Design an enzyme around this catalytic site. Sequence first.
Site, PDB file in Angstrom:
ATOM      1  N   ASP C  43       0.839  -1.188   0.000  1.00  0.00           N
ATOM      2  CA  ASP C  43       0.000   0.000   0.000  1.00  0.00           C
ATOM      3  C   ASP C  43       0.882   1.249   0.000  1.00  0.00           C
ATOM      4  O   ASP C  43       2.107   1.173  -0.130  1.00  0.00           O
ATOM      5  CB  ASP C  43      -0.968  -0.026   1.181  1.00  0.00           C
ATOM      6  CG  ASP C  43      -0.281  -0.335   2.491  1.00  0.00           C
ATOM      7  OD1 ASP C  43       0.932  -0.619   2.473  1.00  0.00           O
ATOM      8  OD2 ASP C  43      -0.958  -0.296   3.540  1.00  0.00           O
TER       9      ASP C  43
HETATM   10  C1  LIG Z   1       6.395  12.921  16.704  1.00  0.00           C
HETATM   11  C2  LIG Z   1       5.140  13.596  17.251  1.00  0.00           C
HETATM   12  C3  LIG Z   1       4.059  13.777  16.187  1.00  0.00           C
HETATM   13  C4  LIG Z   1       3.135  12.567  16.060  1.00  0.00           C
HETATM   14  C5  LIG Z   1       2.123  12.725  14.926  1.00  0.00           C
HETATM   15  C6  LIG Z   1       1.520  11.395  14.473  1.00  0.00           C
HETATM   16  C7  LIG Z   1       0.269  11.008  15.256  1.00  0.00           C
HETATM   17  C8  LIG Z   1      -0.973  10.887  14.375  1.00  0.00           C
HETATM   18  C9  LIG Z   1      -1.318   9.434  14.059  1.00  0.00           C
HETATM   19  C10 LIG Z   1      -2.815   9.216  13.847  1.00  0.00           C
HETATM   20  C11 LIG Z   1      -3.354  10.021  12.667  1.00  0.00           C
HETATM   21  C12 LIG Z   1      -4.158   9.177  11.680  1.00  0.00           C
HETATM   22  O1  LIG Z   1      -3.978   8.008  11.615  1.00  0.00           O
HETATM   23  S1  LIG Z   1      -5.381   9.976  10.600  1.00  0.00           S
HETATM   24  C13 LIG Z   1      -6.350   8.716   9.722  1.00  0.00           C
HETATM   25  C14 LIG Z   1      -6.999   9.350   8.495  1.00  0.00           C
HETATM   26  N1  LIG Z   1      -8.075   8.514   7.991  1.00  0.00           N
HETATM   27  C15 LIG Z   1      -8.010   8.000   6.634  1.00  0.00           C
HETATM   28  O2  LIG Z   1      -7.083   8.260   5.948  1.00  0.00           O
HETATM   29  C16 LIG Z   1      -9.135   7.121   6.092  1.00  0.00           C
HETATM   30  C17 LIG Z   1      -9.219   6.901   4.584  1.00  0.00           C
HETATM   31  N2  LIG Z   1      -8.114   6.078   4.124  1.00  0.00           N
HETATM   32  C18 LIG Z   1      -7.121   6.636   3.225  1.00  0.00           C
HETATM   33  O3  LIG Z   1      -7.225   7.761   2.863  1.00  0.00           O
HETATM   34  C19 LIG Z   1      -5.958   5.773   2.733  1.00  0.00           C
HETATM   35  O4  LIG Z   1      -6.311   4.422   2.839  1.00  0.00           O
HETATM   36  C20 LIG Z   1      -4.681   6.018   3.540  1.00  0.00           C
HETATM   37  C21 LIG Z   1      -4.962   5.876   5.034  1.00  0.00           C
HETATM   38  C22 LIG Z   1      -4.123   7.408   3.242  1.00  0.00           C
HETATM   39  C23 LIG Z   1      -3.640   4.983   3.125  1.00  0.00           C
HETATM   40  O5  LIG Z   1      -3.238   5.291   1.821  1.00  0.00           O
HETATM   41  P1  LIG Z   1      -2.752   4.065   0.836  1.00  0.00           P
HETATM   42  O6  LIG Z   1      -3.128   2.746   1.463  1.00  0.00           O
HETATM   43  O7  LIG Z   1      -3.436   4.204  -0.502  1.00  0.00           O
HETATM   44  O8  LIG Z   1      -1.257   4.123   0.643  1.00  0.00           O
END
Ligand SMILES: CCCCCCCCCCCC(=O)SCCNC(=O)CCNC(=O)[C@H](O)C(C)(C)COP(=O)(O)O
Lengths: 459, 104, 88, 178, 56, 68
Positions: C43
């Site tokens: 991915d």
């Molecule tokens: C160092 C101190 C800073 C720490 C910052 C980090 C902490 C934040 C961690 C949590 C934030 C999140 O997860 S925010 C989660 C956001 N929600 C979504 O993205 C749902 C829809 N899915 C998609 O868009 C794609 O599947 C995708 C996920 C892009 C994958 O891309 P590919 O599969 O096509 O490669």
Amino acid sequence: MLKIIIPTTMLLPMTWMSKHNMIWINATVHSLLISLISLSLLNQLGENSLNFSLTFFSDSLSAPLLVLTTWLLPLMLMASQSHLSKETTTRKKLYITMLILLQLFLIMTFTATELILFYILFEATLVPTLIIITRWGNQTERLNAGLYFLFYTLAGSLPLLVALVYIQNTTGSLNFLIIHYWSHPLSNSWSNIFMWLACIMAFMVKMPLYGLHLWLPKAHVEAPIAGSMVLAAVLLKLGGYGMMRITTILNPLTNYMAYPFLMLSMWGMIMTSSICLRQTDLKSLIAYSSVSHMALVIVAIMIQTPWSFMGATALMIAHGLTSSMLFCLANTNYERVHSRTMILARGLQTLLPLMATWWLVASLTNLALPPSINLIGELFIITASFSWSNITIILMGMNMMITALYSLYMLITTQRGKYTHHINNIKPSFTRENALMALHILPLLLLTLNPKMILGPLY
Amino acid sequence: PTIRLQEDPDPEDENLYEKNPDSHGYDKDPIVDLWNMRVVFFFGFSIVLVLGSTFVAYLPDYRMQEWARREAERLVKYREANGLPLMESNCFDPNKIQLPEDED
Amino acid sequence: SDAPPLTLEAIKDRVLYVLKLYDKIDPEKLSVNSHFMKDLGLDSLDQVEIIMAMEDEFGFEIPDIDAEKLMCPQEIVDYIADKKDVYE
Amino acid sequence: AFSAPAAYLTHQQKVLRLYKRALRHLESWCVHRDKYRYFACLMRARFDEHKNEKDMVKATQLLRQAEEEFWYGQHPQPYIFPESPGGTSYERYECYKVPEWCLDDWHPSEKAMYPDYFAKREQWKRLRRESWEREVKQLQEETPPGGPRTEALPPARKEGDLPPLWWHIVTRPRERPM
Amino acid sequence: NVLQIVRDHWVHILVPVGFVFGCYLDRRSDEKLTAFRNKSLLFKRELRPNEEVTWK
Amino acid sequence: KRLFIIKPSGFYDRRFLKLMRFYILLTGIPVAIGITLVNVFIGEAELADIPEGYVPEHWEYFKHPISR
Ligand SMILES: CCCCCCCCCCCC(=O)SCCNC(=O)CCNC(=O)[C@H](O)C(C)(C)COP(=O)(O)O
Ligand SMILES: CCCCCCCCCCCCCCCCCC(=O)OC[C@H](COP(=O)([O-])OCC(O)COP(=O)([O-])OC[C@@H](COC(=O)CCCCCCCCCCCCCCCCC)OC(=O)CCCCCCCCCCCCCCCCC)OC(=O)CCCCCCCCCCCCCCCCC
Ligand SMILES: CCCCCCCCCCCCCCCCC[C@@H](O)O[C@H](CO[C@H](O)CCCCCCCCCCCCCCC)COP(=O)(O)OCC[N+](C)(C)C
Ligand SMILES: CCCCCCCCCCCCCCCCC[C@@H](O)O[C@H](CO[C@H](O)CCCCCCCCCCCCCCC)COP(=O)(O)OCC[N+](C)(C)C
């Protein structure tokens, strides 16, 4: 001193009788010879001046100025033959005639024993300069500049004429020697105040004083390169020479008549140094630099001490040489790229290394690096001002910082960084331009070697 | 005509290096150019600069600096030998100055 | 002197070496022209991790707009070669 | 730097960029390799927990909290590669990059050395001169009537064509010119 | 052949001739300011048995 | 392996520097040699008292031969 005046009047028909392709060579050679001849005036006494005749005399203050003028004429000739190549023969001869007439008027002005004759010559200098600016300038602003150059001068000088003749109807003489020996104090009355103003305002507007300086950016920006050279290096020093001469009859009124002009000079020196920090035009930056340095010279003349006069003389000589060099350096880039914007042609040190060295030396001298004569004059003026009042070291100190900033700013803007990609017409530097830079810069350090030649009569 | 006036076009600038690879930047004619360079270099550096600096460096002392030093040495020697003060606050003899009679 | 004149063969060897240390790809199944989403079934997060591993290995950063496009090891090698002026 | 940008970034692109930035700053915090691998795996799990959100509004809201958390917990002095736009050698060699057209002004004595190089230069200049008329015509043909909408350029399609506007990309000075 | 040389480079003597003429005119001006020659209190001097004037 | 290093034309700056050095030396080496010869073989004047009845010439009031 006709041994210097007559060869210039002979430069006139030699130029007008020259073959069409030999005007520049003859003019430059004989102008250099005239400068070598005028070098003999540096042998001054310690008590009085060189009284050649009833009409002309030479002093320790006017001899360096005469040497600078006669040395500047050939430099103008070399700097002018590039952009006048397509001109007709008659107009080239007319341009050289204007330059020669300007040199003749300046030579006679710096040595006149009489104040009315000094006024006549110091006013006659306008016509060749005005003709040069309004005829051989490049853009349409030049016409307006000429007007700004003319009336600003005349509105200051016409009252002076009146005052002058008034003095001659009271003391019976305007000869400088008799005026000095038969000097009497000026009382505190309204008539004496207005006489002081009439005697001072012409030279204060030719400096130019802050607030009265608006003509200078126009005149020094729309003029051709030789016009800018002569306007910045010599024609601004007419005000200083005239004030140093005329102040002998204004005491003790100056003791309190200098306050508004001292305040204007200091605050406007700070203001113009700050203006130099935000300038999109490279020529305007040099013009405002000239304004700041001449404000310092005004302060030195106004506080009326021997150290101040010494520093003022050194500063006028050093500023003349340095500003002429800076104008020529800017004109090289202008002739290459046909634009005056500073951020247009960048990173020129990569393309022109020796030109970058010339730029570095000119900028280092502009910020008064020791032991250059620029620093000697500035430090003498600053010491005199400190004796005048301890608080001045604030404002002066402020200026010392700001100058350096904008000076290096110009360098860092024009020589460092990366070259502009779309500008591909930057040819290697010609031998003529390098020789012009060398002939500007070598006399500066040579005078640094023997600084008492430019320290004036108070030495 | 949709134009305003009859005028020549603005011509392109001429590069002096095209017809003269070693052009010195003085003139389009190579010979006049070379001799302009030669006269400038000879009369500016060789004649005026070096010889003028030599002439200025060896100018005779008309400012009387050495004479003043010798005079000061004489006066210091005399006044120290005979015990007189080295300098006087009055530069003019009071005997030749006539103050006004009445100060009240 | 300084570092030796990196070549295309060296770059390809290093990229394949780094990729063959990844636990999510089979070393036998991996080839120079294998696609990350299609042939290898990774991915976008795995592609970001691969780009970061390449950045660590060669010691220079690849901008995100350019890194988004590299999909096969040959593309990574080509981008590195064009970045570092390698022609042999 | 090589690719033409788009009018905007997609949600997936923003998420990937935030993931890379968070990983790099966490590595800047965790100096040692094993600790970094541990916390990078933790961050990867944290990221892929919400990977399957069908509600775009809630996804962008989660991204908003992610950006806020990153800005609060970022490293004040993150590691920068030496040649990156913040590194210690970002533009160190730009003073040694000289444009090729400068060689057109060399004295014939200078050109007397390196004769074969200047012969190859003449060949390249001739190729560019021949190629220019075609490059302009191809750009004229392939352009929509309302002006270009992106900064991407077309490739060469004809028998012996060259990609339009190629001269200044091909003749880059170098990365270590002098 | 010197005809063409002269008619081309005769403009090179105007300035030196002007220099000599200026020196001569300076001497002529000097000769009209001798009202105090050998008469100042600081430099008044007895003439040598041969010389006629202290300075020209 | 050796590559071509692109530089701006260094011919003209070098030529100008050579010409300036040549002319400066052309006129200044004779001057230095003459000054050294004068200094060695014609020293400076020695300070002395004016004898009675003698009126020295003005140039006799200076000590260096070139200044005199
Ligand atoms: C160092 C101190 C800073 C720490 C910052 C980090 C902490 C934040 C961690 C949590 C934030 C999140 O997860 S925010 C989660 C956001 N929600 C979504 O993205 C749902 C829809 N899915 C998609 O868009 C794609 O599947 C995708 C996920 C892009 C994958 O891309 P590919 O599969 O096509 O490669
Ligand atoms: C390529 C340039 C590129 C562009 C750059 C820009 C250039 C622009 C230039 C523009 C034009 C410039 C023109 C300016 C004119 C200035 C001329 C002038 O006024 O001359 C003055 C001055 C001459 O003084 P003077 O008033 O004429 O003489 C009065 C006395 O009556 C005399 O005393 P005396 O009776 O003892 O006789 C001494 C005599 C003879 O004395 C001796 O022979 C004895 C010497 C001692 C050696 C004893 C032991 C050695 C031998 C032992 C073994 C052999 C004997 C036994 C045999 C058996 C073997 C064991 O030697 C001399 O006369 C001095 C040499 C004359 C030089 C004149 C300079 C002219 C320059 C004009 C041309 C400018 C262009 C440059 C071209 C010049 C050439 C490259 O010339 C000097 O420069 C003197 C300097 C030497 C003093 C030592 C230095 C002390 C350093 C202390 C400071 C340390 C701090 C760090 C700073 C380091 C910096 C060095
Ligand atoms: C844009 C920059 C251009 C250059 C600026 C040049 C600056 C010129 C300013 C002139 C300096 C001083 C002028 C007069 C000297 C004293 C000024 C006055 O304020 O002092 C008091 C004067 O008192 C009152 O102020 C009376 C004067 C009030 C009327 C003057 C008009 C001031 C208005 C300011 C307008 C701005 C002028 C500039 C126009 C461009 C002193 O009291 P007094 O002892 O009694 O007068 C002394 C003369 N005595 C001895 C003969 C009696
Ligand atoms: C390209 C690379 C360059 C770097 C390499 C250069 C190699 C070395 C050359 C550099 C020389 C270093 C300088 C060291 C100082 C030595 C010279 C010095 O000693 O001479 C001075 C002399 O200097 C001269 O006085 C100054 C020269 C005069 C300057 C006039 C410039 C020419 C006129 C051109 C027009 C002017 C326009 C500006 C208007 C004013 C001494 O002054 P002074 O204490 O007395 O002498 C006492 C003994 N005397 C009196 C018997 C002679």
